Design an enzyme around this catalytic site. Sequence first.
Site, short mmCIF file in Angstrom:
data_model
loop_
_atom_site.label_atom_id
_atom_site.label_comp_id
_atom_site.label_asym_id
_atom_site.label_seq_id
_atom_site.Cartn_x
_atom_site.Cartn_y
_atom_site.Cartn_z
N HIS A 68 8.87 0.54 -2.57
CA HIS A 68 9.51 1.13 -1.36
C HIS A 68 10.79 0.37 -1.01
O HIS A 68 10.91 -0.17 0.10
CB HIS A 68 8.53 1.19 -0.21
N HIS A 72 14.38 3.21 -4.56
CA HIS A 72 13.58 4.40 -4.20
C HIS A 72 14.42 5.29 -3.28
O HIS A 72 14.49 6.52 -3.50
CB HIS A 72 12.25 3.99 -3.59
N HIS A 106 14.84 7.26 4.54
CA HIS A 106 13.48 7.79 4.87
C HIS A 106 12.44 6.67 4.84
O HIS A 106 11.38 6.90 5.39
CB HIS A 106 13.09 8.96 3.96
N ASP A 107 12.71 5.52 4.21
CA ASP A 107 11.73 4.41 4.09
C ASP A 107 12.35 3.09 4.57
O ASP A 107 11.88 2.02 4.17
CB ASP A 107 11.21 4.28 2.65
N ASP A 217 10.57 12.81 -2.37
CA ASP A 217 9.83 11.54 -2.19
C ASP A 217 8.92 11.26 -3.38
O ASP A 217 8.72 10.08 -3.66
CB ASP A 217 8.97 11.57 -0.94
N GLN A 269 -4.52 8.89 -11.18
CA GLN A 269 -3.22 9.62 -11.36
C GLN A 269 -3.50 11.12 -11.58
O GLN A 269 -2.78 11.94 -10.98
CB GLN A 269 -2.37 9.00 -12.47
O1 LIG Z 1 4.73 7.32 -11.61
C1 LIG Z 1 5.38 7.23 -10.36
C2 LIG Z 1 4.62 7.52 -9.13
C3 LIG Z 1 5.38 7.91 -7.98
C4 LIG Z 1 4.76 8.20 -6.78
N1 LIG Z 1 3.38 8.07 -6.66
N2 LIG Z 1 2.61 8.15 -5.57
C5 LIG Z 1 1.34 7.99 -6.09
C6 LIG Z 1 0.12 8.09 -5.33
C7 LIG Z 1 0.17 8.24 -3.94
C8 LIG Z 1 -1.04 8.34 -3.22
C9 LIG Z 1 -2.25 8.29 -3.91
C10 LIG Z 1 -2.27 8.12 -5.31
C11 LIG Z 1 -1.09 8.02 -6.04
N3 LIG Z 1 1.28 7.75 -7.46
C12 LIG Z 1 2.58 7.75 -7.83
C13 LIG Z 1 3.23 7.45 -9.07
MG LIG Z 2 7.57 6.59 3.28
ZN LIG Z 3 9.52 7.28 0.08
#
Ligand SMILES: OCc1ccn2nc(-c3ccccc3)nc2c1
Ligand SMILES: [Mg+2]
Ligand SMILES: [Zn+2]
Length: 313
Positions: A68, A72, A106-107, A217, A269
């Site tokens: 973050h 990003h 935004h962050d 995002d 994932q």
């Molecule tokens: O590879 C890049 C990536 C980018 C954003 N996110 N956000 C999550 C996420 C958010 C909440 C729960 C579980 C996974 N996983 C990812 C992986």
């Molecule tokens: Mg955020």
């Molecule tokens: Zn963000």
Amino acid sequence: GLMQFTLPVRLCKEIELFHFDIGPFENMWPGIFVYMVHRSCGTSCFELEKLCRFIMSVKKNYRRVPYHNWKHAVTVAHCMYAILQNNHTLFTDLERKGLLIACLCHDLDHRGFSNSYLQKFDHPLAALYSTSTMEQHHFSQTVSILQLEGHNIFSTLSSSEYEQVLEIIRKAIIATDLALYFGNRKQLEEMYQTGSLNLNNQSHRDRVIGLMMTACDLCSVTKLWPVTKLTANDIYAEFWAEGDEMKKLGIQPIPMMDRDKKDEVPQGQLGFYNAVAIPCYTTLTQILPPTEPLLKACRDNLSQWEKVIRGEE
Ligand SMILES: OCc1ccn2nc(-c3ccccc3)nc2c1
Ligand SMILES: [Mg+2]
Ligand SMILES: [Zn+2]
């Protein structure tokens, strides 16, 4: 006035593509953002002296956290630039201005911890803001920076345009709270299917901009596999630190945040792509057909995580 930003040829071409990675050269990111503002909005949108001073103060108020962070911010702004450039005539002059600044901001001042950890810690921000805790902080920090002397990039807007743009930025930044995403997309799904979706209805545009913000995002899941895979490490470095801090409050974290349960990440994932990312880019593609490359890249990365589980990598 006649001073364009011009990128090297490979960047000049690839920056137009959804899957563009802004690279490891931090000192090029401000120029990449100004370039995007100039092509998206116009060279007149902002006083370059003020824009440059706004960008460098936004940079300074992002922390050195694994995910973050300032990279990003710029990554999320590039995805928005790609969405706006592929949907030329759907967005007002004010919306093009507001949304690139919204994504950049935004962050602001993220510490690498979720709204849940702030509440369980009993952090002051959790008493000041009961829901969307960090996101109300991110908007608060944006307004602060806009009110620094020489930093008001919106000075030339009329009183009513100024109020509209801050309102666009506020809603856009609140929408980055993933807890709000599920209900927003379900509503957008119903409206599109029953045919009631209407982009002249402000409450409807608001929802569509909300989905765009979630889409930008999450855009790290729409990159080439190597970018997606290595960004996953950064996001999990924050999750595991938050998990460590949960254990120090004497609370077993959800497995996603527990560094003792790394084996479960591929499956976690899959759940994230199926429950969050794929539905987000599907609804976005239905509303804004030209954003289909995001959905296609996201499916390609789902398939790559499926290969990790099957031991093929
Ligand atoms: O590879 C890049 C990536 C980018 C954003 N996110 N956000 C999550 C996420 C958010 C909440 C729960 C579980 C996974 N996983 C990812 C992986
Ligand atoms: Mg955020
Ligand atoms: Zn963000």
